Write a structure and sequence with these properties.
The structure is cut from a larger assembly and holds one copy of chain A and five copies of chain B. Chain A is an alpha+beta fold. Chain A is built from 27 helices and 55 strands. Classes of the chains: A alpha+beta, B alpha+beta. Chains in contact: A-B, A-C, A-D, A-E, A-F, B-E, B-F, C-E, E-F. At the A-E interface, strand 48, strand 53, strand 54, helix 24 and helix 27 of A face strand 1, helix 4, strand 4 and strand 5 of E. Bound molecules: zinc ion (ZN). Chain A binds three DNA and RNA strands through helix 12 and helix 14. Chain F: It comes from Mycobacterium tuberculosis.
Chain lengths: 1110, 147, 48, 49, 147, 49
DNA sequence: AGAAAACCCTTTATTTGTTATATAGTATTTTATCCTC
DNA sequence: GAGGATAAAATACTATATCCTGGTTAAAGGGTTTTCT
RNA sequence: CCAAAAGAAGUCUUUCUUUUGGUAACCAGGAU
């Protein structure tokens, strides 16, 4: 549509969108360039927040500096963070297992406050991992994604909880800071206002107020409008400020002698000295907004103040009093109401920059601790800024973050859509967020403030449902971490084109209409009554004069993955959730095909994911090949694009890239120049178009099972390539000298045929489980001084030749060609982990066809494993001899409420055959509002039905009534959309017509070949002698507690006794039963399991005298 | 009753163990914080893996190598002291550590309700003072010599 | 095919909520990698 | 849990609008979370019984 | 008195004495139940009980050496307190105070941890086991089969 | 004490069983499953065994 | 005989101190206050 | 006014279905030892 | 229970004898 070479996909959309879809990877990239402080972010903030532009690093270095000693006779300060160029390109870093990072330098200045001798230096602060142009990090070769975290913003939260004993309303307030100490004010069943500083027992608020320097006269002067505060003051029992300080000291400081100076200083230290208490800028902003204190002054300062505390107490007591609004002296009035903590005005987003800033902050705190401890144990005038700084904790924090965290994860690379979905994810679980096992049902709900900001459909189906969400298409995150959505403001009933981004609170104040409303070509609603959203998400019918805003489009409340489901509004939310979640499990196929009926989101999602090659500058193609494309730019310069051929992804799939241009074509900037894994000419192509029938067939498509044609196996329609990675390295060791070689002890030559002259197998050789990939031997150890042997070694010269082959064998259940071998070595001064001499990596590839038990799926949540694969002759075939490819059961459709698949089938038939609306005498009425150049289409036409503005039922019916014949003038599918099929197995025609069409089905990464496993006997564990677990070792299936209850219920005592003794851990029973079976004898009697004896020994180790009596 | 168990069980009895039972189960005393010699890869002596205490690491092979044959059985080498037998015995033989001071068991001190504080009638708060060297306790007094 | 004749095999689906989550069948060889289950035992196993 | 008094007025054959779809998701997700969280309580109860 | 009498009657009825609450020797579990195995490259994988036993042995040896050498009462009591804390960590790590942490600031697995929870000996290994002669796969529909 | 220790609160059951010096007669299904003996139900009782 | 680069041991210390997303259930110690003598 | 007995609150411990696979496994500092010049 | 080497017999490739060699916990992600 707005891409220079996109395919012509004609849309059914009736509406027009004013706003283009933003960059879909803007969250990550605009959050990181704020952290490092790029000029791009500087300009972006200038045209917005020019009042105070500062990056994350500069903020950390400003809050840290200066670092002073108690005497104040010397200080250390930091400034001007600076980055060098990256150490190596992205491709080299990924190939050689190097972290993609850049050096960081700061200017530390040391001042002696009694000699004025200033000493500045440039201090190296470590290597800082840098984000690539696709929103990912490259840590130790692998590609990672940092996920954005949904947390609760810091501020003041008022809530009311009923009381069981008295049936009274009990209000409360919590002042949650960033990295500080809490303090709650509450009204208990008795009419008194308490306080819980830090986390202690309730104390009257009067104690705190007096400790802050308030006389009993001032309190009753300002807080004289409530009976509760007077009641609390009267029964205070505390007179004098010092007494209040002492009481607070008693409560807070356990078992210490109270005094005046310590109590005076500790209270101000806890909440007012900003080294132990911070609110951030978001917290200060939220407190000022809730209480309305400083509307004008800019936010500089992050500590509490007496004004804030007194205002909070007054707000709480007036809320309990039942007031409506409150004005604070020196500040505008505000409404008095309780808070909802699940409101997207109270939940903010910690993006990829905020998290790294927090980690740098703790690292710098540790470093400054070391610095100020080291400033007192070194003699002055020998100190230089380089001898105080210890950079190791800082670099340690970064490593800990990027290696160990629940937000730093391996990038999801099942297919291109998976990674884009991974980068736009908002997870509520992490360090500092709630927990999967401790999350209720009120936080998993879809609050009405999510509209336009978090997609209500796309979320995990398991125990993570509701705790992980995804960002909508048009949403952006503002400077404080709050999500915004564009709205089209309507002035005096005229729908303008001024787009304004509103966060959930502003959207709360106003009244918002709907996108699919009847605009009359002049920005005027046809009727006065339109559905709107009122304050608490209420939906009503307001006359079209109060409306303030309208949505920029439908498809504003959905995310990227959910915007690719055609006919989404005909499917219930339960099945649409599955349809969106199963699109990121599809596996790339050997050849890709774009859907006949899409939604128009595929091109944008494909170009923004980044798996395609896009012309950086316009020019003319000079050379094309399977390996590269050379573009000749309009001005002299040339550029060569290299391709990724058969490269493994994080999940073991193929990552091909092939060109889609010829040697003479001219390309334009931003034009797709080479396809990717799951792209067909620049558009996402996750599956294939299959001819489908919707009948029950002989019980093989029974209960969600599926029937496939054998053509899909012969013609490699659903074939995929899977690649495996195997690693081994040679390490020094204390004994020394690990070696990769062909000379392996106790190995014959027949099992050393595929290996090349120096170990590793040859490229192209097919392997089976157990074959050796890299030959390797290590010292046998047991360095022993046996007289004759040792005296022969020492002077006579007998060699050690102690070897123990730790070779690399291909594990159980694996095979395929050897496509690549990557060998590192210390001889070539390659950067390897310390103590490693050599490192070799072998890639093994398989090509898998579709087979029974493999999982398939559509875009509407119609999953199911393949039940049978019929020969092409015994399948229902059309009157012209065309067999169907897939057969789906009827009983699954009407009960699940996903009728969108039937409409997709009808429109797919119409698109495949091509149509022509006969406007011989006037266009038909059903085709009146149908866009032009949709009145006719050629066979195999690609169309698009946007998610909430697509093809109506009347238009589908009309298109079905007029559809082109195939070769002879025969129309196979009638106006109802059904065809007369023949039974290819018996020969007779089926008595009634059946629904046929084209559906777009996907192959999911749940194949049987990874799921099948069996075991007679094999490896056993060590501590307990039970069999191992897992397919790669061998392992047995687990016979758990529930399966034991089932067998006890049946009454089968002998089966249960043998299963637990002579099949698991009866060490002599195992061998005896094997011998009895092979020799044809009777199975012997079981003994005692070994785990019971292990249990007895552990109990005895706990100093318990366990003994078995007779 | 049974010792190595032949499944003639009639009962399973649990109870507190005294020091005399602990040093009766034992086959030796561990008195060095060593596990294994990294170079020869053989267990050290008087360590956590000593072959004299816990038994041979290899079937019918002593530590010093004087005995290596099955014919030798049930005899303790006079040099290394390792008893020549099957290596499976390392799953069965226990040692013990002879503490230089008495130490309480945390199961009968901490677990709520405190069972030492019920046996002796002491609140847990001040029992923790006694057993962690944070206060003295009067264990005995003469009440007539006093008078 | 001679060995497996009239030798029962126990099939089990997790979670085994009740007794009929384990039942014994008579195996027969099939082409493929998937276990074929009778349609009239899915209510007992609760197996779609 | 209280009824929205609007109500949704379209069938899934006609296709719901954006607001109707939103207010329907409100209860759809509640239903899904209910199952997700009862699957474990059933097993704990059976284990105790 | 009703609560107290439970334990007092328990210690009264039986011939067992209450002195088993205070320990003078500690048993050591057989090596095969706390194994260290050779990972390729001269790297070993300890069982995480060896660290806890080593701490006990080190503290006991230091206290034993500080008594014969002669020292004030302050230092000897400090060593005894630390020895007391080591055995507590060996038997139940983290029930009193800060858990003893190994590499990566992860608490060690004490003896009590081998018995508790879904991953304890009982539920994990005694009541449910992995077995031989087993297999698994994906089920499909068998409309041609008999019942 | 074996069945109760394997059910819940292993540490508390074990400590109070040790203090009471309890003896287990091994008469239940779970206790016979743990030690590897034929359960006293169905086909494992003396009438049929 | 002295200097530099690689081993062996320890320990995550625990202050008159660097740590705030669960609820639901029961059980046991404080403790605070009220009632009585 | 003092002591005891009963509500209250405050901490302490315990539990939350089954199955599968994939990536990592210590750092940092002090004292010492050995080899090289 | 397997691999390698040597000796003997026959078959043209099996048997007999001797020697050597022979795992877990965390965190994370999915499925029903
Ligand atoms: Zn010997």
């Amino acid at each position: 549509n707005s891409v220079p070479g996109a395919p012509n996909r004609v849309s059914f959309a009736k509406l027009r969108e004013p706003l283009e879809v933003p960059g879909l990877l803007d969250v990550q990239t605009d959050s990181f360039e704020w952290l490092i402080g790029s000029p791009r972010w500087r300009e972006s903030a200038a045209e917005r927040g020019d009042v105070n532009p500062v990056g994350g690093l500069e903020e950390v270095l400003y809050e840290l500096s200066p670092i002073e000693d108690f005497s104040g006779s010397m200080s250390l300060s930091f400034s001007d963070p600076r980055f060098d160029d990256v150490k190596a390109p992205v491709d080299e870093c990924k190939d050689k297992d190097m972290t993609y990072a850049a050096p960081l330098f700061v200017t530390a200045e040391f001042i002696n406050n009694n000699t004025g001798e200033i000493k500045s230096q440039t201090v190296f602060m470590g290597d800082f991992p840098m984000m690539t142009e696709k929103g990912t990090f490259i840590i130790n070769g692998t590609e990672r994604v940092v996920v954005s975290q949904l947390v609760r913003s810091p501020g003041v939260y008022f809530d009311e909880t009923i009381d069981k004993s008295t049936d009274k309303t009990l209000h409360s307030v919590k002042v949650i800071p960033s990295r500080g100490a809490w303090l709650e004010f509450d009204v208990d069943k008795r009419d008194t206002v308490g306080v819980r500083i830090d986390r202690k027992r309730r104390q009257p608020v009067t104690v705190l107020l007096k400790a802050l320097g308030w006389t009993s006269e001032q309190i009753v002067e300002r807080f004289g409008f409530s009976e509760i505060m007077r009641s609390t003051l009267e029964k205070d029992n505390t007179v004098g400020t010092d007494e209040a300080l002492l009481d607070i000291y008693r409560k807070l400081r356990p078992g210490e002698p109270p005094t005046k100076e310590s109590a005076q200083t500790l209270l101000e230290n806890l909440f007012f000295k900003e080294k132990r208490y911070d609110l951030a800028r978001v917290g200060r902003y939220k407190v000022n907004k809730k209480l309305g204190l400083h509307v004008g002054e800019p936010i500089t300062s992050s500590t509490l103040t007496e004004e804030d505390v007194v205002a909070t107490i007054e707000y709480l007591v007036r809320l309990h009093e039942g007031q409506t609004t409150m004005t604070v002296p020196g500040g505008v009035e505000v409404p008095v109401e309780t808070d909802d903590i699940d409101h997207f005005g109270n939940r903010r987003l910690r993006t990829v920059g905020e998290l790294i800033q927090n980690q740098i902050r703790v690292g710098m705190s540790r470093m400054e601790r070391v610095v100020r401890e080291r400033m007192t144990t070194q003699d002055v005038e020998a100190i230089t800024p380089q001898t105080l700084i210890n950079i190791r904790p800082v670099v340690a924090a970064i490593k800990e973050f990027f290696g160990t965290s629940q937000l730093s994860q391996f990038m999801d690379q099942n297919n291109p859509l998976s990674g884009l979905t991974h980068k736009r994810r908002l997870s509520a679980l992490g360090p500092g967020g709630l927990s999967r096992e401790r999350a209720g049902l009120e936080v998993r709900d879809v609050h009405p403030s999510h509209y336009g900001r978090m997609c209500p459909i796309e979320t995990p189906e398991g125990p993570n449902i509701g705790l992980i969400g995804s960002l909508s298409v048009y949403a952006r995150v503002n400077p404080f971490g709050f999500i915004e959505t564009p709205y089209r403001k309507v002035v005096d009933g005229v729908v303008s084109d001024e787009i304004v981004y509103l966060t959930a609170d502003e959207e709360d104040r106003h009244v918002v209409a709907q996108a699919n409303s009847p605009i009359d070509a002049d920005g005027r609603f046809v009727e006065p009554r339109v559905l709107v959203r009122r304050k608490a998400g209420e939906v009503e019918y307001v006359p079209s004069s109060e409306v303030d805003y309208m949505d920029v489009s439908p498809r504003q409340m959905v995310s990227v993955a959910t915007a690719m489901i055609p006919f989404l509004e005909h499917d219930d939310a339960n099945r649409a959730l599955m349809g969106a979640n199963m699109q990121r499990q599809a596996v790339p196929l050997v050849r890709s095909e774009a859907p006949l009926v899409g939604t128009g989101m595929e091109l944008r999602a494909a170009i923004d994911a980044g798996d395609v090659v896009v012309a950086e500058e316009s020019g003319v193609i000079e050379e094309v090949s399977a390996d590269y494309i050379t573009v000749m730019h309009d001005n002299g310069t040339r550029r060569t694009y290299r391709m990724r051929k058969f490269a493994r992804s994080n999940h073991g799939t193929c990552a091909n890239q092939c060109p889609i241009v010829d040697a003479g074509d001219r390309v334009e900037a931003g034009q797709v120049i080479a396809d990717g894994p799951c792209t067909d000419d620049g558009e996402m192509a996750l599956g294939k178009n299959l001819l489908v029938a919707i009948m029950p067939w002989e019980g093989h498509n029974y209960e969600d099972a599926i029937i496939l044609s054998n053509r899909l196996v012969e013609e490699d329609v659903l074939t995929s390539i899977h690649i495996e990675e195997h690693e081994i390295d040679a390490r020094d060791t204390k004994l020394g000298a690990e070696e990769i070689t062909r000379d392996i002890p106790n190995i014959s030559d027949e099992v050393l045929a595929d290996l090349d002259e120096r170990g590793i197998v040859r490229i192209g050789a097919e392997v089976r489980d157990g074959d050796i990939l890299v030959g390797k031997v290590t010292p046998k150890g047991e360095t022993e001084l046996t007289p004759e042997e040792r005296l022969l070694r020492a002077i006579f010269g007998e060699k050690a030749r102690e070897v123990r082959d730790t070779s690399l064998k291909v594990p159980h259940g694996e095979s395929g060609k050897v496509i690549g071998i990557r060998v590192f070595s210390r001889e070539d001064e390659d950067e390897l982990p310390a103590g490693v001499n050599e490192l070799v990596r072998v890639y093994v590839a398989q090509k898998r066809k579709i087979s029974d038990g493999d999982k398939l799926a559509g875009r509407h949540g119609n999953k199911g494993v393949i039940g049978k694969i019929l020969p092409v002759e015994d399948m229902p075939f059309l009157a012209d001899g065309t067999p169907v490819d897939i057969i789906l059961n009827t009983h699954g459709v009407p009960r699940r409420m996903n009728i969108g698949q039937i409409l997709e089938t009808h429109l797919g038939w119409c698109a495949h055959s091509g149509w022509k609306v006969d406007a011989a005498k006037g266009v038909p009425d059903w085709a009146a509002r149908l866009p032009d150049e949709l009145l006719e289409a050629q066979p195999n036409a690609i169309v698009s039905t946007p998610v909430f503005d697509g093809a109506q039922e009347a238009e589908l019916q009309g298109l079905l009534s007029c559809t082109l014949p195939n070769r002879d003038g025969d129309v196979l599918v009638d106006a109802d959309g059904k065809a007369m099929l023949f039974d290819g197995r018996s020969g007779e025609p089926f008595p009634y017509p059946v629904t046929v069409g084209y559906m777009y089905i996907m192959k999911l990464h749940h194949l049987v070949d990874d799921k099948i496993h069996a075991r007679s006997t094999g490896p056993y564990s060590m501590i307990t002698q039970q069999p191992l677990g897992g397919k790669a070792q061998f392992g047995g299936q687990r016979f758990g507690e529930m399966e034991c209850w089932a067998m006890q219920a049946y009454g089968a005592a002998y089966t249960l006794q043998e299963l637990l003794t002579i099949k698991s851990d009866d060490t002599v029973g195992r061998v005896k039963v094997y011998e009895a079976i092979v020799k044809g004898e009777n199975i012997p009697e079981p003994g005692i399991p070994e785990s019971f004896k292990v249990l007895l020994k552990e109990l005895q180790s706990l100093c318990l005298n366990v003994e078995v009596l007779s | 009753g049974a010792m190595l168990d032949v499944n003639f069980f009639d009962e399973l009895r649990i109870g507190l163990a005294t020091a005399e039972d602990i040093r009766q189960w034992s086959y030796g005393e561990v008195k060095k914080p060593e596990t294994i010699n990294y170079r020869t890869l053989k267990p050290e002596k008087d360590g956590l893996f000593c072959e004299k205490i816990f038994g041979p690491t290899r079937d019918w092979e002593c530590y010093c190598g004087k005995y290596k044959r099955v014919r030798f059985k049930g005899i303790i080498c006079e040099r290394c002291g390792v008893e020549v037998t099957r290596a499976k015995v390392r799953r069965e033989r226990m040692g013990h550590i002879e503490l230089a001071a008495p130490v309480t068991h945390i199961w009968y001190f901490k677990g709520v309700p405190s069972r030492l504080g019920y046996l002796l009638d002491l609140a847990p708060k001040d029992l923790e003072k006694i057993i962690y060297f944070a206060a003295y306790v009067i264990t005995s007094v003469d009440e007539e010599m006093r008078h | 095919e001679e060995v497996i004749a009239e030798h029962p095999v126990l099939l089990n689906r997790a979670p085994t909520l009740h007794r009929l989550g384990i039942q014994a069948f008579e195996p027969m060889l099939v082409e493929g990698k998937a276990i074929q289950l009778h349609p009239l035992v899915c209510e007992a196993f609760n197996a779609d | 849990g209280e009824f929205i008094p609007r109500p949704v007025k379209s069938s899934f054959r006609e296709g719901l609008t954006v607001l109707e779809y939103f207010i329907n998701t409100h209860g759809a997700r509640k239903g899904l979370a209910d199952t997700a969280l009862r699957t474990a309580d059933s097993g704990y109860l059976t284990r105790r019984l | 008195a009703l609560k107290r009498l439970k334990v007092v009657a328990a210690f009264q009825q039986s011939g067992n004495s209450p002195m088993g609450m205070v320990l003078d020797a500690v048993p050591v579990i057989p090596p095969e139940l706390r194994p260290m195995v050779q990972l390729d490259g001269g790297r070993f994988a300890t069982s995480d009980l060896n660290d806890l036993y080593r701490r006990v042995i080190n503290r006991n040896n230091r206290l034993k050496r500080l008594i014969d050498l002669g020292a004030p009462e302050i230092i000897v009591n400090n060593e005894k307190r630390m020895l007391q804390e080591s055995v507590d960590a060996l038997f139940d790590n983290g029930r009193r105070g800060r858990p003893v942490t190994g590499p990566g600031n992860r608490p060690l697995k004490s003896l009590s941890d081998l018995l508790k929870g879904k991953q304890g000996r009982f539920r994990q290994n005694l009541l449910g086991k992995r077995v031989d002669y087993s297999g698994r796969s994906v089920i499909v529909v068998g409309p041609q089969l008999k019942l | 004490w074996l069945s109760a220790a394997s059910f819940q609160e292993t540490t508390r059951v074990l400590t109070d069983a040790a203090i009471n010096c309890r003896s287990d007669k091994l008469n239940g299904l779970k206790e016979n499953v743990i030690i590897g003996k034929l359960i006293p139900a169905g086909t494992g009782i003396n009438r049929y065994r």
